[PDB]
Amino acid sequence: NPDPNANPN
């Protein structure tokens, strides 16, 4: 769903 380069933390 989210952008792969978005915040994963």
């Epitope: 769903n1 989210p2 792969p4 380069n5 978005a6 915040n7 994963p8 933390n9």
Partner: antibody, heavy 122, light 107 residues
Framework: QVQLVESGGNVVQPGRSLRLSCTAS????????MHWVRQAPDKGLEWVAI????????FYADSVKGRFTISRDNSKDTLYLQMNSLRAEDTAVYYC???????????????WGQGTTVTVSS | DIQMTQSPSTLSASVGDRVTITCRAS??????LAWYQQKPGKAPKLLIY???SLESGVPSRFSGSGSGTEFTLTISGLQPDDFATYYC????????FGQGTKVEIKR
Amino acid sequence: QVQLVESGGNVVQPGRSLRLSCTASGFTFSSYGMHWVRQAPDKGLEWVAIIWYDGGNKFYADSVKGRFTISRDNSKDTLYLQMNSLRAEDTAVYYCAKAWYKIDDKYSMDVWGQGTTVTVSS
Amino acid sequence: DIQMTQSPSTLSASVGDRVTITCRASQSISSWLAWYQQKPGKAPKLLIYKASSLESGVPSRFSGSGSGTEFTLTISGLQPDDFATYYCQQYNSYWTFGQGTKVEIKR
């Protein structure tokens, strides 16, 4: 200081499986996403997979889709990479890297582990 | 995908020189570019993030510059600890690295 220790690298025959590990210390593991990156002279540095802090969202490089499965156990501070039906071109040093927290729109990785060696051969 | 290409592949310089490593992108990545350093047998080390921001604990002799498709990593006053390989990495769409640039001792 952030500490990432990879484990599980070994000689594996083509078509077989192998699971790597990455135990972390020196920070709160459950708070960060994690990457897998492999290095070999034929591929240079090649990104493998990323997983969110909670283990939900996962992404993979195209060449490993359907064969590699990334997961994490936050109660153990361990990151895993399940590699199935391994091929000769999967031979490399595999790094786990912590996602960074430079607050912006796009994110990457800052601290890498020491790596673990996977040799796919019969 | 977005392919990175560094230049040159191997650079020869001496201590105290100003060296320049160039990274080129296949499409516009704005300023989402990171620079890493790697020494033989060791892991990569983050040097520059967002094209020009210096990672904490990194000497001031490292400077980053660039935008869009062309980027440059400059090391003013080269020191013995700097002889290593330098990679660029875009993080605009997934993560892809350049082939690497080895800085060697000139003689």
